[PDB]
Structure 1
Amino acid sequence: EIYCPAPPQIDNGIIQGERDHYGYRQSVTYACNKGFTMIGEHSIYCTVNNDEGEWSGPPPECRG
């Protein structure tokens, strides 16, 4: 099996439900802390394009 990265995340947010190993189609979900408003969505997931990796999109950000 192939395993997705951790990844090094995130600015102004927090992790909900952290398992150490991320596999196929499993999504990370990041809530921004109390005092920051959204820029875009929350949850990205893992993809496969070659035999290694990878993640699907860019990480979110929050303004406040």
Structure 2
Amino acid sequence: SNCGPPPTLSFAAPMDITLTETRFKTGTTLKYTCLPGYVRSHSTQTLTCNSDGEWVYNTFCIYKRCRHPGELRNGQVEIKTDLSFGSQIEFSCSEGFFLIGSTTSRCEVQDRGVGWSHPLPQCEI
């Protein structure tokens, strides 16, 4: 019965905020749901009370928007919709430049953030 109320998280909220119990037994799990603007990153969306009365979790929701990958020297990075999770951008080269690497990239779940499936290609020769 070592854990107190769970911390407030930037990415998730508790499902069922009733309970009102101020102390939680070692081992109890609380189910969480992503706050708006965040996407599910892991299967397990829980907080667990461990032996030392701290809540243990990984970051299981992440901010949904990727950043713009930058300028494509000798070519073009085109937004099709936005830069949000799931969305895709396309790369093309101008003139007669040969594009090496990927022609598209999707904003996808990665590490402890969100990111591009493929990097910016190059436009050479």
Give the TM interval when normalised to the shorter protein.
0.7 to 0.9
Tell me which stretches of 4 or more aligned residues in structure 1 moved more than 2 Å. Answer: 15-19, 49-52
TM-score by length of 1: 0.73
Question: C-alpha distance in 2, partners of 1:22/1:39?
Answer: 22
Partner deviation per Cα, 1:8-56 (whole Å, 9 max, x = no partner): 121111133465x411211110110013112133111111135532122
TM-score by length of 2: 0.42
For these two proteins, the number of residue pairs brought into alignment is 63
Matches within 5 A, 1:37-52: 37-50=98-111, 52=113
Gaps of 5+ in 2: 1-36, 38-63
* CA distance 1:50–1:17, change in 2 (3 Å): closer
Matches within 5 A, 1:25-40: 25-40=86-101
Gaps of 5+ in 1: none
**Aligned match of 1:8 in 50, 63, 70?**
70
Percent of aligned positions that are identical: 25
State which drifts further: 8-17 or 23-32: 8-17
- Alignment of 1:62 onto 2:119: no
* CA distance 1:17–1:4, change in 2 (3 Å): closer
Query: What is the Cα deviation at residue 6 of structure 1?
Result: 1.4
Which structure has more RCO (C-alpha within 8 Å, separation ≥ 6)?
1
Secondary structure of the structure 1 residue equivalent to 2:116: coil
Question: C-alpha distance in 1, partners of 2:65/2:79?
Answer: 17
Q: Which has the larger radius of gyration?
A: 2
Secondary structure of the structure 2 residue equivalent to 1:46: strand
